[PDB]
Design a protein around this ligand. Structure first.
Ligand SMILES: CC(C)=CCC/C(C)=C/CSP(=O)(O)OP(=O)(O)O
Ligand SMILES: [Mg+2]
Ligand SMILES: [Mg+2]
Length: 429
């Protein structure tokens, strides 16, 4: 479309998330107004407990949106038929938007697989959220189902895993930890004792779709061990969350919250698959302690940004898993607005720590092939970081985000109207 057409639409109808074209113009506006002017502080305008939350997320990476977003959005009803879900829930998760904006330069199928991984986290997360309820309302049978489901999901990933190197089989086996007694090494594979295949989990079609894609696209030619490793890390992290939420006593320090979020943020699973889509790839990076720390900084930054944006909804849930609330519980002088400011500052320091690790990792590369592989893998994580910021910035239509931001709808409609008008005015120059 031409700037004049979209300007006419925006003046009449405003911005939406149901017309997928609008998101291309929103992302283009954000790059021209912020990144292109050397301003890497993106605005977040929301509320928490009636307090105005007006902050900026620092992220110095180039904004972009996948060219496949149009087709992904156009096929969302068929995608959603895979899931056990209402459309209301599917629309708020909006994995078409998440993947298109965090994975902007991949093929259609390599973008969709990231959508699937993020949706898996969201659906498992909302099943775990039953434990947020007061103890009076918790149903032990739903918790039994949840615990059984994640073991069966875990085995489905185990079932596509047949590493070429025996040390890689041992890497995963030793990493199973408290799940290890349920499995055995057969065939050169890890297999769940069939005694425990006692149900079909509600999202088994999703998990089978993921496993089939990784099996058919990457397992023939690539070492997929890190994908398996990150899924094991995630599933164990969910079990850790079940334990903490089931205990109804939340005593995590901020450092322990960080260590926990390192496991459950799910972006490391998306990165592991995206790493496999590039010829520049170093499997040895995943056991480099500095690279492992870089991945942890990335998960924590996304966590802290998410903590600010979801604070009001989680406050009403009485959910303690939020750095904003951890800081308030430690420091009685903080209200929600002041706590959000401290979290944003922590996210800035983590971003600087991420950039310091990046320079160290690239300097340590042994040869050109390894340097180019590491630079590509770090770029993939940077894509996720700016993508997540713009994801939260662009929550402009109620029902199509986890946390709708009516002040951002108003702010972006006002600012993009002026930017499009300036485009039309100077046309064709
Ligand atoms: C969508 C992407 C790319 C990453 C964000 C992942 C993330 C931080 C999710 C929050 S998990 P949690 O805080 O337990 O969930 P809610 O209470 O916010 O529903
Ligand atoms: Mg949250
Ligand atoms: Mg949380």
């Amino acid at each position: 479309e031409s700037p004049k057409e979209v300007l006419s639409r925006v003046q009449d109808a405003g911005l939406t998330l149901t017309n997928p074209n609008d998101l291309y113009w929103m992302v283009d506006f954000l790059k021209e107004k912020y990144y292109d002017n050397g301003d890497y502080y993106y605005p977040i305008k929301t509320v928490c407990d009636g307090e105005s939350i007006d902050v900026k997320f620092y992220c110095p990476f180039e904004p972009s949106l996948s060219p496949h977003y149009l087709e992904l959005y156009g096929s969302r009803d068929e995608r959603a038929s895979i899931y056990e879900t209402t459309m209301k829930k599917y629309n708020r998760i909006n994995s078409e938007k998440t993947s298109a904006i965090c994975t902007p330069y991949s093929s259609y199928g390599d973008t969709q697989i990231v959508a699937y991984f993020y949706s898996m986290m969201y659906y498992i997360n909302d099943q775990t959220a039953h434990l947020k309820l007061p103890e009076s309302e918790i149903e032990s049978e739903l918790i039994d189902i949840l615990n059984d489901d994640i073991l069966i999901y875990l085995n489905e990933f185990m079932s596509i895993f047949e590493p070429e190197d025996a040390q890689d089989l041992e890497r995963i086996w030793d990493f199973l930890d408290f799940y290890q007694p349920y499995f055995s090494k057969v065939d050169g594979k890890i297999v769940l004792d069939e005694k425990y295949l006692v149900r079909t989990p509600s999202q088994m079609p999703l998990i089978k779709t993921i496993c089939e894609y990784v099996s058919e696209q990457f397992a023939p030619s690539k070492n997929i061990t890190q994908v398996i490793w990150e899924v094991v890390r995630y599933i164990k992290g969910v079990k850790d969350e079940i334990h903490i939420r089931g205990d109804k006593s939340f005593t995590l320090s901020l450092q322990e919250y960080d260590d926990f979020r390192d496991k459950v943020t799910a972006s490391p699973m998306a990165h592991a698959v995206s790493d496999l889509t590039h010829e520049r790839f170093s499997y040895e990076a995943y056991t480099n302690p500095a690279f492992m720390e870089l991945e942890n900084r990335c998960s924590e930054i996304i966590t802290y940004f998410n903590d600010v944006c979801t604070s009001d909804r989680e406050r009403l849930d009485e959910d303690p898993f939020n750095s904003v609330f951890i800081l308030m519980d430690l420091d009685p002088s903080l209200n929600f607005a002041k706590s959000c400011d401290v979290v944003v500052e922590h996210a800035y320091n983590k971003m600087q720590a991420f950039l310091k690790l990046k320079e160290e990792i690239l300097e340590s590369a042994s040869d050109e092939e390894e340097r180019l592989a590491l630079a590509r893998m770090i770029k993939t994580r940077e894509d996720s970081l700016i993508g997540y910021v713009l994801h939260e910035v662009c929550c402009v239509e109620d029902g199509y985000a986890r946390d709708h931001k009516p002040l951002m709808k108003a702010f972006l409609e006002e600012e993009i109207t002026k930017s499009l008008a300036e485009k039309v005015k100077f046309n064709p120059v």
